[PDB]
Design a protein around this nucleic acid. Sequence first.
RNA 1: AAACUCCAGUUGACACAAAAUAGACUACGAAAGUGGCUUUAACAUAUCUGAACACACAAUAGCUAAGACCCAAACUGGGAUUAGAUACCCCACUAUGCUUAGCCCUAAACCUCAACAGUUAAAUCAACAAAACUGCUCGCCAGAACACUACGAGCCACAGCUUAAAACUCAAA
Lengths: 74, 128, 86, 97, 117, 122, 72, 23, 137, 48
Amino acid sequence: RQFSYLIENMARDCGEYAHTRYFRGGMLTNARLLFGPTVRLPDLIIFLHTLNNIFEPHVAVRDAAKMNIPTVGI
Amino acid sequence: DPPPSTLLKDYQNVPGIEKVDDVVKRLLSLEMANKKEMLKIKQEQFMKKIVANPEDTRSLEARIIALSVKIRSYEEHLEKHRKDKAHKRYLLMSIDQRKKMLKNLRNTNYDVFEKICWGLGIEYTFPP
Amino acid sequence: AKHLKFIARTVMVQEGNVESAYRTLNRILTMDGLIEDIKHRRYYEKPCRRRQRESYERCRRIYNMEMARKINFLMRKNRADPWQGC
Amino acid sequence: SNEDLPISMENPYKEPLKKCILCGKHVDYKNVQLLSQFVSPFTGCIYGRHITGLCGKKQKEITKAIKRAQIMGFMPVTYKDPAYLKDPKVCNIRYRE
Amino acid sequence: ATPSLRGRLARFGNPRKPVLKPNKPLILANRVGERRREKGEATCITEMSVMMACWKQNEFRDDACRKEIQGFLDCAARAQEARKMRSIQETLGESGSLLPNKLNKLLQRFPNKPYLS
Amino acid sequence: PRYELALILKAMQRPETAATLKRTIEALMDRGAIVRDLENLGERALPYRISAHSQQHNRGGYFLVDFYAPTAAVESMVEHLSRDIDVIRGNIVKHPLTQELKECEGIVPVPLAEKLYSTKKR
Amino acid sequence: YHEDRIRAKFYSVYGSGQRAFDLFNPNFKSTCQRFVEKYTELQKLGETDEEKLFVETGKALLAEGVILRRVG
Amino acid sequence: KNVLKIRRRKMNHHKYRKLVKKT
Amino acid sequence: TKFSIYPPIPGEESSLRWAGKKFEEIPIAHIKASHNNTQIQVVSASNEPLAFASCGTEGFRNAKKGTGIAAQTAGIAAAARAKQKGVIHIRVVVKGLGPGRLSAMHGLIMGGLEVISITDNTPIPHXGCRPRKARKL
Amino acid sequence: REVLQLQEEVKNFITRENLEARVEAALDSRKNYNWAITREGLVVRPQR
RNA sequence: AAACUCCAGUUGACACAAAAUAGACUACGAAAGUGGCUUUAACAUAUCUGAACACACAAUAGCUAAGACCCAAACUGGGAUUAGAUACCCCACUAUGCUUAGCCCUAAACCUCAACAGUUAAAUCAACAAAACUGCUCGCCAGAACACUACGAGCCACAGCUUAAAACUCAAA
Ligand code: FES
Ligand SMILES: [K+]
Ligand SMILES: [K+]
Ligand SMILES: [Mg+2]
Ligand SMILES: [Mg+2]
Ligand SMILES: [Mg+2]
Ligand SMILES: [Mg+2]
Ligand SMILES: [Mg+2]
Ligand SMILES: [Mg+2]
Ligand SMILES: [Mg+2]
Ligand SMILES: [Mg+2]
Ligand SMILES: [Mg+2]
Ligand SMILES: [Mg+2]
Ligand SMILES: [Mg+2]
Ligand SMILES: [Mg+2]
Ligand SMILES: [Mg+2]
Ligand SMILES: [Mg+2]
Ligand SMILES: [Mg+2]
Ligand SMILES: [Mg+2]
Ligand SMILES: [Mg+2]
Ligand SMILES: [Mg+2]
Ligand SMILES: [Mg+2]
Ligand SMILES: [Mg+2]
């Protein structure tokens, strides 16, 4: 969260997308329900931090692989 | 048993031990030491009498002599402590481990096996 | 019985404050383990039960001391949120 | 090969091992002044090593020395000898609030 | 210093008999016990007997024992507020380092991880 | 071996105290002991009351006798001290200076034990 | 690194310098690093003794105006 | 584990010991 | 001088005094706090009985003897008989962890006696007689 | 070296000849085994 | 309540009983066990496994003989409780716990996790418990119940111990 604001601005500046908030269950594996049947998912997910705030892997790492989305991660 | 006046194994080969005061000889003798020191003297006597090299302690002969000295100490202990079940076990186990040493020495070196039996007064017996 | 008297387990009263003197004495006897010892000596505790109690009390100390160590370690993090809103 | 690569060796900054206040000193049963420093003033109870700060080797020597001195007629059992109440306080325990 | 746990539990590779037989795994939970209560004990009994002691001597005549009665009466009033003030102090959390609910939110943020991730 | 006799004597005048030490040291010599030194620790109040030979004692003279003797002399000497009416309490211990203190490097820290429980999720 | 042996002794003998580390400047040189550089130079001049190579280094810095307050 | 197997053996042994006393 | 909770040692030269009497000369209040009954005896420093009061001697019976207020009443009674004999300052020696352990001391104070020291003499065997078996409840 | 050290000490041992003289000499002297330790590990000998 | 008032409290004298604190230590022993002090003797094996055909041990309870006896305490007696109370609660007291000399040879004698060597590599891994395995050897096991039983044999054991089935029964345990 020290860098949430910085990362959110970098995404907007490059014309891309940021998710720095609490990651809800099924954003990727249940995207059609949450957003709609025609929702387009990300083609690439870049992790600037791969751990959540309890020192475990971010749930989106596993869920990105489930949806066969390539991940870049520090 | 060696005489009480016998010097300890450590002080027997220091130069000039025969010219020191009598009081100093008593303090370096078996009389002023524990029984374990008397057993080290007994082990040395058997080594020179039996083994070809008295300095080789890892030979099967030396182990049989070392254990035979322990066996005699257990017997003397149990003569006064007849309800000491712990040392009765050590005695019976030690007798069985010497027989296993004597067996392997008889199979490997009979000429030495005979000298060990004569020297230590062991009558080898075949198990039933 | 054979020792001198008024030396062991003796606390002097200051300015007639008997309440504070008794609390000091009781605190002394507790820290030295005499109170729990006296309590556990009213009825015979059989060895199996004493061994079980000692194990339970020793395992409790380890857990309580390790939980205390973690609380002290994390207490600095109880400060206000530096990134409120993010 | 390369001069800037790390080299294998033992930690040069490693601190010397800590020692108990009695490390290297002889614990005699006749030295009641020393032994009295490790018993409770009010009850004569031997302090545990978490109070005395001694290592296991010296905690045992102190315990065995106290038990020997007590029954041989050198040390009281039920209280600390009052002569030794003003000696240096080496144990980590406070009985007053 | 926390007591040692090396060689204390019955385990493969540990030759000796176990020193400890914990009925629960020695693993820190992510919560602490509740702020327990001290079972209440009867109050003001010392004043109660001063009132009752004088009553017996003066044949239960209040006029003679007015001063001893006012003592017991005031002591009871103070204990009724002291108990209520005690409840307010409990919420404040001054006595403890932290309230069990405030100390559990802190453990929620740094949960013990006895497993691999 | 080398022994140390911790001797608490009845509080007496100098002449009777000297006779007791001589009579006690001669008993050691009669049993084959080589007496090395005699140390006076001073007369003091006992840590507790000691009853010995139908008498109650509150003070005593503390003396040490360093000597070498055969192992069989100890048992016989302990019996001798039990009958001497001027001895309050006598103990024979192995001389502490015989036991050589091994060197100590310091306190080796004990790390918290690991892998006591499987890493399965509970 | 080899110099870690020199750094351990310098901190033991003279302690940490009262001068403050500036880890933001990538070319910062502490009193210990200045000591190590002089210690390395004198070793390359053929001196091989350790206790002698350490005392001569302190003198060189004092001549240059460096403050070396021995801890004990 | 429960002690139901131990309990079966407990009663068998009790009844046997009692039978032997009776006869 | 700073206050010492350690009692003055007999034979040494202390400056503490109570009505001109040394610590060794102050009478002793022996309180036996049992689980059922409290017994209080005030004796002189020369071991001469001066007063005795128990919960039973003050008209309490059965479970009423094993109460704090019963011991407090016994303390007042012992204090009254002790004060008549010239006792002001007393040394308290309490043995036992009964309910009248502290309450008995209050009664001594309410009865007019000044407690200068408190000593615990609860018998603790160091290994001794086997206590009775545990009760099933 | 141990026999040499021991040979000198034997000169100061007690014998039936010097027994009475060594007893009186002991009664006149005092040996103190008491000393205290500090939190810093320093010995504090007694004031005598 | 009964019981005791030759009772209780203070002080002194005071053991063939039991061993606060230390011990938050984790050691010794083959196991059983072993935590007051001193001394003496003293803790098998210079490959490993290995005797249920042997030898020597083995908590507690128990038997036989002679002693000790503080306290505890089966049984028993009294008090109380209860519909009953052959219990739980209270008091008293014995066998017994102790010593000596013989026996008896049993424990949830279980840390229910065999000895020796080795591995953390993976295909980790039913579940739970105390992670998963490799080499090698001995011991043991093969539905439940009958059955720590019957019979036989052995034994200082005689209402005993060890070894230990079958028939009938069930479709589960
Ligand atoms: S740390 Fe060295 S003896 Fe204690
Ligand atoms: K003890
Ligand atoms: K078990
Ligand atoms: Mg293995
Ligand atoms: Mg369990
Ligand atoms: Mg259960
Ligand atoms: Mg059945
Ligand atoms: Mg219940
Ligand atoms: Mg009645
Ligand atoms: Mg084998
Ligand atoms: Mg077998
Ligand atoms: Mg048995
Ligand atoms: Mg028996
Ligand atoms: Mg009784
Ligand atoms: Mg009945
Ligand atoms: Mg009896
Ligand atoms: Mg006994
Ligand atoms: Mg067991
Ligand atoms: Mg089994
Ligand atoms: Mg096997
Ligand atoms: Mg059976
Ligand atoms: Mg059978
Ligand atoms: Mg049969």
